[PDB]
């Protein structure tokens, strides 16, 4: 009656995982100015997107079980580690330090946040040593018994952040090999799960900027016409909440103090970039946020937030729950200097549900950092001569819900974001990877000639 017939190249696919390869824009693929994420090895990208819209198709997405974020995480660590090998390691720096407070032109805030340390260092010859001095932030030294030492010396050595490599978060595109395709969910109301009414296939994704931060998403992509709240299980207090802003709120950060970079010869061809002296007044670093806009933004977050927890509930915000500095503070880096800002002023309000104020956030700075929350790995960021300031782009929050039962009409949300994947998960939620299956068999009235 009916007779098997085989078709090749039919449009069928299934969920899968593969080793996506990078693709970079012409600007980052030809300047060749030693970007840390190594886009020189990354292949130049396509001249323009080849987006193809798939009509009548419905596909299911899941941004919390997406393997794209897991692969991106591993790639970032390897790129960061692979960029520290060729430049100097600061193993001789683990020596006793004689430190004293700096009080030349100190402002009231920075009473004791800087230490003037002097130590004996090895000169070009292996049998003679010379006394040298450097300025160290208070958080990067600890007492031995004055006498001081670096925090890391009892944990591991530190590799100096090489001076020619740059940490600018330039975009990167993750593109799939042949036989695979990337599906983009173009629905505006799709949060993180469920069928996507409108789906399109792309050669590969848009430029994802690997911006590293905590409690806040900076220089990210914005939502469309609404604030989006996404969580693996909203009813579960242990799961983080990802907020996305439709309209960005600008935050300005700076390091007012003016300092000069100084080079110390620790060996043949090896130099340690110390902090020589501070020029002019010494003032604490800080960041500014427009109070009117931030208050307006919080009025939009609560509007969407109250839907999940009940329109009659009281919404309250509070600062972090305490603990390590890396978690309790909004970490980032302006230029090449790492910041750790106190966000206790942003998250302080209560909602009852019926132009230059510039909320300022004091920020502390460190030079010995455990970037990826690892143990036994270290990097030293040398000082940047001159003042530094930058304007940023807030586009989301990483909130965690303090557990209060219905025996309370109150929902206590505090900043969170310990795991670093959620930072990139905010942008890779649209994309999924599938495997093409061009083999198919269907029935029809067809014989062979014989």
């Amino acid at each position: 009656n009916l007779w098997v017939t085989v078709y090749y190249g039919v449009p069928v696919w299934k969920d899968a995982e593969t080793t996506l390869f990078c693709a970079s824009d012409a600007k980052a693929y030809e300047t060749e100015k030693h970007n840390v994420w190594a886009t020189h090895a990354c292949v130049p990208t396509d001249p323009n997107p080849q987006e193809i819209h798939l009509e009548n198709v419905t596909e299911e997405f899941n941004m919390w079980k997406n393997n794209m974020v897991e692969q991106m995480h591993t790639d970032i660590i390897s790129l960061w580690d692979q960029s520290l090998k060729p430049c100097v390691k600061l193993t001789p720096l683990c020596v006793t330090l004689q430190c004293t407070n700096v009080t030349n032109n100190i402002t009231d805030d920075m009473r004791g946040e800087l230490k003037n340390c002097s130590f004996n260092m090895t000169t070009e010859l292996r049998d003679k040593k010379q006394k040298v001095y450097s300025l160290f932030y208070r958080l990067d030294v600890v007492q031995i018994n004055k006498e001081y030492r670096l925090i890391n010396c009892n944990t591991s050595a530190c590799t100096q952040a090489c001076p020619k490599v740059s940490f600018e978060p330039i975009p990167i595109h993750y593109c799939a090999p042949a036989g695979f395709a990337i599906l983009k969910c173009k629905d505006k109301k799709f949060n993180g799960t469920g069928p996507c009414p409108s789906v399109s296939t792309v050669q590969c994704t848009h430029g994802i900027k690997p911006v590293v931060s905590t409690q806040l998403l900076l220089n990210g992509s914005l939502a469309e016409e609404e604030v989006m709240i996404r969580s693996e299980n909203i009813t579960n207090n242990a799961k983080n909440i990802l907020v996305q802003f439709n309209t960005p709120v600008q935050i300005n950060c700076t390091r007012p103090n003016n300092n000069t970079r100084k080079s110390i010869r620790i060996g043949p061809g090896q130099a340690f970039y110390a902090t020589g002296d501070i020029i002019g007044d010494i003032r604490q670093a800080h960041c500014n946020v427009s109070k009117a806009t931030w208050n307006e933004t919080l009025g939009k977050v609560v509007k969407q937030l109250r839907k999940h927890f009940g329109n009659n509930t009281i919404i309250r915000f509070a600062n972090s729950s305490g603990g390590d500095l890396e978690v309790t503070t909004h970490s980032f880096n302006c230029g090449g200097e790492f910041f750790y800002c106190n966000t206790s002023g942003l998250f302080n309000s209560t909602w009852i549900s019926n132009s230059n104020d510039s909320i300022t956030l004091p920020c502390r700075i460190k030079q010995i950092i455990n970037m990826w929350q690892r143990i036994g790995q270290c990097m030293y960021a040398p000082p940047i001569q001159g003042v530094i300031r930058c304007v940023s782009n807030i586009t989301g929050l990483i909130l965690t819900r303090d557990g209060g039962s219905t025996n309370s009409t109150t929902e206590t949300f505090r900043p969170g974001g310990g795991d670093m994947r959620d930072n990139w998960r905010s942008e890779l939620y649209k994309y999924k990877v599938v495997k093409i299956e061009p083999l198919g068999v269907a029935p029809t009235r067809c014989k062979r000639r014989v």
Partner: antibody
Amino acid sequence: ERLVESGGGVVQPGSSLRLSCAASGFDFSRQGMHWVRQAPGQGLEWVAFIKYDGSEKYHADSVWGRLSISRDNSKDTLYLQMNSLRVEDTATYFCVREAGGPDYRNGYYYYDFYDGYYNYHYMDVWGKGTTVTVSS
Amino acid sequence: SALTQPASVSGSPGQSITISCQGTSNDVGGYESVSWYQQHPGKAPKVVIYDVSKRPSGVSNRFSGSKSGNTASLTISGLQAEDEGDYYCKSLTSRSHRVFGTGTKLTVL
């Protein structure tokens, strides 16, 4: 190894004068210097000491506020400002070197800031000296 | 306040003599950095005992020095004609200053 002094003369009480010293044969920029004045029949009296770079100075109590010590490594010279001289100030001033060197420890040689010398606390080379007298 | 020294010391050739220098706990009893100097008329003094019990190069082995609490002394053995002259004692102070002694006159009979 020879310190040459100059500036001798006769001045009235309350006058001002400068004593100049020159050094050669050794690295003047690494070692501290002394000023010592001696009078006929009187024991040696110390005036002042200056670090190899001038960052630290010390003046004897007997002459505090009247005499100061200064140096200029760029010129390999040592200076002493005589201000408001009096009858008791007449004496022969000697331009002296502070013997010193690296501090041997743990098999290494330790030199001060900018490869400066540590003090061994004795005087080795002395200049011929200069004389100044006060009279009415 | 210079260190106290005997006004004069005498001794015939072939004898052994000692010159005493006394200070305070702040200067003499605080450090071993005590020096002795020999001087002749018309020339600046020369250091003979730069540390408490050591001598520089070029000086005779007859010299000897010692310290005892708040006092120090210089010993010369086998007195000879050329040993006649003046001697001074120096010591470091607690406040990084240097103090000389009153001086001693050595006479060879």
